[PDB]
């Protein structure tokens, strides 16, 4: 009587979801071919022996969907959930949201309707995507629109891979990323800002690897999401549903852009020479060095923090360490929210994916913080945007596809308002 739909769109979303299903099918004893030698949340019974995951993979470039169909988990999924287009997205917006996305949106909605009726105790969605891409934003925006006007009450969990400050894999990413804010506010409830450069540095310093890759990226993201959903899936002294976030992390439904953090991210040899108690782990959690987004909260405040401690952890130690961390001077809360740390506990440790660089740990803490510093990120991005739209760069590739250009400034207007709203909640009253 518990379940979540895991919609994966775009390109980064689908690879992150591939690694996520790897981790899930692993920790539940499920074999990658589907059979089995606590899972009603993600995987469901398929009326013939094995189990199938609650997921749908939309994409237009058939390469990644083909790689999934010919990879290891070919027998895992349902040959309908893998919706493959006919061409590429070309890293623009109207070609995934106005002209072509209308070919696949209706089929996707029928498949999502099927998945919804095949479930009873729905609790939410989990969309993974980038926005610097062409279909991860466009088709994602259209899907968010159709769902918000179709289902309603069920809260969506966006996991968007934004553009990092310096590392760049596209030149037009600010344009289509701004083109997604006009629909991220309205239709989406929770948005976990994830960058890349921060996670690259994380893999560099802690995991000691000097040749990291997108696969390790996705492994870490999968770990974070599994630690997020452990409360639904498993035991725990203080369980926390997915309807707890809305009551604990959303002051006003127009400012809901959270950022993640995870611990302990340690290699093999760097755990031997340590202690790694709960106190040290909850100090390391808040360190902006190993935060999973590009932001320095020292130049911001914290509205709320949902911490989920999985593994053998006693509650009194959590309470004491929370008191200490809140008593520190350099980590300051807002005045209008004095009791900010929500905490939950699960009695299951991490389950390391085979072949990973991490180490088995008896404990782990996953923090999701609704903060006010993330706002500057948006501001920074606008900067980039302006320095292009001041000279009408690449506007032709969007106007060629019915996209009324007058939306652009509107977005850069609307997103701009967001900054003001943050400057409305940073007011020390």
């Amino acid at each position: 009587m518990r379940e979540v739909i895991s919609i994966h769109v775009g390109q980064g979303g689908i690879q992150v979801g591939n690694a996520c299903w790897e981790l899930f099918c692993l920790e539940h004893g499920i074999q990658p071919d589907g059979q089995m030698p606590a899972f009603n949340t993600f995987f469901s019974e398929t009326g013939a022996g094995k189990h199938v995951p609650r997921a749908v993979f939309l994409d237009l470039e058939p390469t990644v969907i083909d790689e999934v169909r010919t990879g290891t988990y070919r027998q895992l999924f349902h040959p309908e959930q893998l919706i493959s287009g006919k061409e590429d997205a070309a890293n623009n917006f109207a070609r995934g949201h106005y002209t072509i996305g209308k070919e696949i949106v209706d089929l996707c909605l029928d498949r999502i309707r099927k998945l919804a009726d095949n479930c009873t105790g729905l609790q939410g969605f989990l969309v993974f995507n980038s926005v610097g891409g062409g279909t991860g934003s466009g088709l994602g925006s259209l899907l968010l629109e159709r769902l918000s006007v179709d289902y309603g009450k069920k809260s969506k969990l966006g996991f968007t891979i934004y553009p990092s400050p310096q590392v760049s894999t596209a030149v037009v990413e600010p344009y289509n990323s701004i083109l997604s804010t006009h629909s991220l506010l309205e239709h989406t409830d929770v948005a976990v800002m994830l960058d890349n450069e921060a996670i690259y540095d994380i893999c560099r310093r802690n995991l000691d690897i000097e040749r990291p890759t997108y696969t390790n990226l996705n492994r870490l993201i999968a770990q974070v999401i599994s630690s997020l959903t452990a409360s639904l899936r498993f035991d725990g002294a203080l369980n926390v549903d997915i309807t707890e976030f809305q009551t604990n992390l959303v002051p006003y439904p127009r400012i809901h852009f959270m950022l993640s953090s995870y611990a302990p991210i340690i290699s093999a040899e760097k755990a031997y020479h340590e202690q790694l108690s709960v106190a040290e782990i909850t100090n390391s959690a808040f360190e902006p060095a190993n935060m999973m987004a590009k932001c320095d909260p020292r130049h911001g405040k914290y509205m709320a923090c949902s911490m989920m401690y999985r593994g053998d952890v006693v509650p009194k130690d959590v309470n004491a360490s929370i008191a200490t961390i809140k008593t520190k001077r350099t980590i300051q809360f807002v005045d209008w929210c004095p009791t900010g740390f929500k905490v939950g506990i699960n009695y299951q440790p991490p389950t390391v994916v085979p072949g990973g660089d991490l180490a088995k740990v008896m404990r782990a803490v996953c923090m999701i913080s609704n903060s006010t510093a993330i706002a500057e990120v948006f501001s920074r991005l606008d900067h980039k945007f302006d320095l292009m739209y001041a000279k009408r760069a690449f506007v032709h590739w969007y106007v060629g596809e019915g996209m009324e250009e007058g939306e652009f400034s509107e977005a850069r207007e609307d997103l701009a308002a967001l900054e003001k709203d943050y400057e409305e909640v940073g007011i020390e009253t």
Binding site: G121, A237, N248, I322, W336, P338, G340
Partner: protein, 420 residues
Amino acid sequence: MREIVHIQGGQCGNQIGAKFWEVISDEHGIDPTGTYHNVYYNEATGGRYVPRAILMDLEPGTMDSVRAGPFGQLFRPDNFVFGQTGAGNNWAKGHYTEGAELIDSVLDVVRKEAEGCDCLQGFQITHSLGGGTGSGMGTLLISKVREEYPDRIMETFSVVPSPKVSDTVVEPYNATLSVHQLVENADECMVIDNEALYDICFRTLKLTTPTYGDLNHLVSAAMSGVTCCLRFPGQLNSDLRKLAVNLIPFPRLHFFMIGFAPLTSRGSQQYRALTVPELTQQMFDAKNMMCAADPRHGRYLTASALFRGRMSTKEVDEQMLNVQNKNSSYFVEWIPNNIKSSICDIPPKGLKMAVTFVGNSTAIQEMFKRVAEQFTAMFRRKAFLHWYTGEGMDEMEFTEAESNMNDLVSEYQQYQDATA
């Protein structure tokens, strides 16, 4: 004769109720198969005993919490009224939207288990004031039952939001929105706070790993001791209504403090000795209780001391007079002999004497400020307010409630330092 029902709501209340039925079975000597090895239990075909309890919650997971634990086979499946969603820390869910879908059935089953008795001494609830499920469902249920049986009493062993160590963020809203009713339609709202429980478990027992099971064990033992002057004979017996008469001067100062004795670690248990002097000196201290309101910061409007075991009644009453005359300032003067005593003739299981202290003191007012103060700093900006605003609430329902809270605490002041 003088029966009691056991309503439990929310995760905290349900777990404490499980621990409390475990302790009651420990005392009356009932193994989990519900066989002997009428005030609380009830008979069933084959000499079986089923507790006159009732379990409710919005999230079904807590079932695998009460049935899995030991002594979980005593209850009856017909007494598990379990929804499917979980109010999710949102009070309005368990009081305006989801509440009114299970309140009908739970009221039906309460009426079923109530008419099945002849002398209904009163209800007693176990829940919290911070969690949405517990707060909302319990307060709506109290509303309905005090609209149903206005003659009986409703005790509530309801915990309060922890003063310092917070684990939720929507806490003060829930606390105020439940106090606004518990001030109106309750009789013995015994309040318990996790901070003082950790204080006891860390300073009176020198423990080193307190799990929620142990806090619940402590509060459940105190719960048993409160009313264990009724199940058993007594040189001077008592019951719930005697407390209700001797403990509330004005019809609204009905929020108590709870303390237990004796409590000892390994060492002190190997060294000290149990005599009425030591038990008294251990009971009337500050950090032997379950409320983060240092009683010296206030006075006791009144306070009952229930003793259990075979003692010398003259020693008990003489030491009551002695402790009243010694710390004369910490008590209140416009009620002479403001301390009350009661004695049962049978100790607990495995002991030879025990003491349960129940003090209606004017010191808890501090608490009803700090939590309230939190509200004042979280409502001036509508923080998280749109959730409750969306489920059908109105801003007045908040504001007046807060004022009511204020009114309540002010009452203490207004008639703490008064005399003639």
